[PDB]
Amino acid sequence: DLKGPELRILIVHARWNLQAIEPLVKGAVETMIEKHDVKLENIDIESVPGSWELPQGIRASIARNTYDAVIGIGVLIKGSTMHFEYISEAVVHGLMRVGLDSGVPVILGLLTVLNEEQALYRAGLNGGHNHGNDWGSAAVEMGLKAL
Amino acid sequence: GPNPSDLKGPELRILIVHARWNLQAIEPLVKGAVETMIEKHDVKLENIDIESVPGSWELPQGIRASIARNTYDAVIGIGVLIKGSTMHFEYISEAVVHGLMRVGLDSGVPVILGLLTVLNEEQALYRAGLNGGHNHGNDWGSAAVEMGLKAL
Amino acid sequence: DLKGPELRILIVHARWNLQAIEPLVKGAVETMIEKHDVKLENIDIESVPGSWELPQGIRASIARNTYDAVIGIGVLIKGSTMHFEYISEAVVHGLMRVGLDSGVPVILGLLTVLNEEQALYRAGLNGGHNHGNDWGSAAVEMGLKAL
Amino acid sequence: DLKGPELRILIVHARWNLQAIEPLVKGAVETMIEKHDVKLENIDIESVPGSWELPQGIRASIARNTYDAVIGIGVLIKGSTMHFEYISEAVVHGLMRVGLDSGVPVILGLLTVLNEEQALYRAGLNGGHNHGNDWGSAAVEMGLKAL
Amino acid sequence: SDLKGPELRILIVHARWNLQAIEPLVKGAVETMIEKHDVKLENIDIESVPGSWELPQGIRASIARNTYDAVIGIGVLIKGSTMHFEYISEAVVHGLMRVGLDSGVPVILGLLTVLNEEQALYRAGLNGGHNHGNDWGSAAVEMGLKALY
Ligand SMILES: O=C(O)CCc1nc2c(=O)[nH]c(=O)[nH]c2n(C[C@H](O)[C@H](O)[C@H](O)CO)c1=O
Ligand SMILES: O=C(O)CCc1nc2c(=O)[nH]c(=O)[nH]c2n(C[C@H](O)[C@H](O)[C@H](O)CO)c1=O
Ligand SMILES: O=C(O)CCc1nc2c(=O)[nH]c(=O)[nH]c2n(C[C@H](O)[C@H](O)[C@H](O)CO)c1=O
Ligand SMILES: O=C(O)CCc1nc2c(=O)[nH]c(=O)[nH]c2n(C[C@H](O)[C@H](O)[C@H](O)CO)c1=O
Numbered sequence A, C, D: 001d002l003k004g005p006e007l008r009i010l011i012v013h014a015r016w017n018l019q020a021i022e023p024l025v026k027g028a029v030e031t032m033i034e035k036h037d038v039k040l041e042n043i044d045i046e047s048v049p050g051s052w053e054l055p056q057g058i059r060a061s062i063a064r065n066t067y068d069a070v071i072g073i074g075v076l077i078k079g080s081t082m083h084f085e086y087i088s089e090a091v092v093h094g095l096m097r098v099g100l101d102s103g104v105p106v107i108l109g110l111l112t113v114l115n116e117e118q119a120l121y122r123a124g125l126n127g128g129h130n131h132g133n134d135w136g137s138a139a140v141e142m143g144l145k146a147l
Numbered sequence B: 001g002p003n004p005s006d007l008k009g010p011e012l013r014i015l016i017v018h019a020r021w022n023l024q025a026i027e028p029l030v031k032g033a034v035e036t037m038i039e040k041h042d043v044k045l046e047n048i049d050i051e052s053v054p055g056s057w058e059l060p061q062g063i064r065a066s067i068a069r070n071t072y073d074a075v076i077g078i079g080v081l082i083k084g085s086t087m088h089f090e091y092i093s094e095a096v097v098h099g100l101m102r103v104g105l106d107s108g109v110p111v112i113l114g115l116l117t118v119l120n121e122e123q124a125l126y127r128a129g130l131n132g133g134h135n136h137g138n139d140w141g142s143a144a145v146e147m148g149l150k151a152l
Numbered sequence E: 001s002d003l004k005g006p007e008l009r010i011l012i013v014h015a016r017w018n019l020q021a022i023e024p025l026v027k028g029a030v031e032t033m034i035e036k037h038d039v040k041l042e043n044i045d046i047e048s049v050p051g052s053w054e055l056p057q058g059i060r061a062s063i064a065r066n067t068y069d070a071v072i073g074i075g076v077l078i079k080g081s082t083m084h085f086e087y088i089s090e091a092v093v094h095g096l097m098r099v100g101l102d103s104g105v106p107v108i109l110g111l112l113t114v115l116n117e118e119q120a121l122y123r124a125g126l127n128g129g130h131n132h133g134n135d136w137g138s139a140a141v142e143m144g145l146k147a148l149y
């Protein structure tokens, strides 16, 4: 039972596919507060237009304030072009780079799905499990293991 | 779908670098991005630099050279890559996307992705606002503004 | 036929798919000790939530203490979405970066499999060969060649 | 159009699939001279064994002399193995990196084709358009815009 | 490459997986440098690592200790039942390129990424095939010389 009452957590989420995003953020937040004793005031929630802006939004923010862990949340859905494949690959490498450059743990809350249904399912709707909960716990653990 | 903001950035300086391959698709995109920033975000026509480079490959290099000279709050890279008979499409696309992300992370300047990676001309025009489609350039204009302001 | 009684080895493993993980960590440890004379107290074993946290957990750890070699262990199983493909590529690139940035050898103990059975087989179950043993020996060898 | 009489241009080309390389190099050189007023003596032409050496050859050369733009030319043809895929991806990333690290424009004159015919076609043979011409103009334009 | 490099120092790092294919490759590279380029046997260091994954790391370690004019990374990756082959191949190739560009020392790609044993042995000069190690040897010499001059 890892508890982190003094942890400061940053959550940056995109706004594309908001119906999937919200449940995810909510799940992450609730899990941190109700199961890890993270204080609501210690959780900054910011947003960016799309998943492409995620790495950049996170970099800008951890350069201004101090956080123990960050969760980047976005939802990319495969469309008719190759856009999905290239953005996904670039965003994932980007998130990894910002975390390794900064030394701050960056939790991956990015869904790269084939359709809307797959995303809602992983957001806890239609019988699925909310992955945001798993992300919230990972943030806490990684924040503590960094001291 | 997208979800842009109301935000006004009258003091923002925005740079737009676009390639010149597949111009019929490029113009509508640039125009949409410009009009949106001005008409919906109060960005000033004089505060918007527009430069061009031959193809999408030059996009990351052109942007890097330009943000080294002047000061911008946000940059929009615009290009259109269409799948051809070889594997060129795949490798250029991957390298350019990686490149744009690197330039933005190295410089700290927000780089908005206005790159279309399509299978045919039709898909490009559709995303440029023609034949009943939605002009993506608009979304890009709003993204530039939002990111420029959040970089304070 | 290399012995490394003075080597300090770090092992960071994820916790997703633990049935596959344990045998792998165990085989790596036993091999180092029993065939390479590595000392039980010279082996640190840490864990992180998932494979994504692997590169970050390793970077944080080799920045605190001094190790001669590190072994990153995790198991990624292909699911219904593209997540598997993007996390795999990013983690592998990430582990290579940490090793090249630090000068500390990073042994790849990441299994990227299509299903659970393939992972267990490579962990020594159902008639397979435990790959953790090979990773144990590789850690020792690289630890020594780094002087 | 654009004229660059004072521009210094470097051309590094591989030697695999020479029958396709030559027309490309020639077309690029002629275009720069005849349409952009670049001076023949201001154009260095070097070669490396294969496309893999391209990024390294260019890096070495631009560290020695001063150029306004570089053109990397090579031809990779898909074979029976996956070699083609991995080298292609690595070389293309390498070229972009060398250009971004140095600040010197690097023009992509790499053909990644499925067969010999596709390469000859893009080199101006069998009714096709020589791509070397486009690369020559790009080098000139980027050299000037770098001032 | 009709080039001669009698003063060149060459490093060869090879993995040990699929040794039956590795050996002919290493041997062909060495013989070619010596017999056709006048490289001196004592100027050629040969080191090994467990697998292809360790190649970039072994090379980086070595070129930080001694001085070489060119390096040849040799390894054989064969496609198996999992995705391992695809991800390791990609990471090792990027890794070798990075080590060469970071250090300024030319790195010759002697990595085979094949679908089966036969393809590897063929490219190693067996069963009527051409030994690719020879081309790598010549490439190493040429790039070493062009880095000095
Ligand atoms: O499928 C595609 O890639 C095309 C449509 C699209 N989709 C998404 C998305 O699904 N999720 C997302 O999170 N974003 C999507 N975006 C936006 C992208 O992150 C970025 O904000 C813009 O490129 C401007 O820089 C999209 O444009
Ligand atoms: O399909 C291919 O890749 C071949 C044709 C081609 N297409 C484009 C394009 O579609 N969009 C683009 O934006 N560019 C294309 N280019 C050009 C390329 O970005 C670059 O300017 C040159 O390689 C020289 O540096 C192309 O050459
Ligand atoms: O298949 C997928 O990629 C989706 C499910 C999933 N699987 C794994 C896994 O298989 N192995 C793993 O080792 N991890 C998996 N994870 C977790 C992931 O490493 C990380 O902990 C979070 O993304 C937040 O940073 C997963 O979420
Ligand atoms: O399909 C393959 O990749 C195998 C055959 C091969 N082809 C080429 C090529 O087609 N073009 C090329 O330009 N090069 C090819 N090379 C050589 C490669 O760039 C490099 O010089 C060597 O790996 C040693 O460093 C090749 O080896």
Ligand SMILES: O=C(O)CCc1nc2c(=O)[nH]c(=O)[nH]c2n(C[C@H](O)[C@H](O)[C@H](O)CO)c1=O
Residues within 6 Å of the ligand: C106, C107, C108, C109, C134, C135, C138, E015, E016, E017, E018, E050, E051, E052, E053, E054, E075, E076, E077, E078, E079, E080, E084, E085, E088
């Ligand atoms: O196909 C796979 O990737 C699975 C089996 C496997 N194969 C090779 C190989 O074929 N060649 C190789 O050269 N190596 C292989 N390795 C080992 C790998 O380079 C590394 O030494 C370990 O991961 C520990 O760091 C393998 O594990």
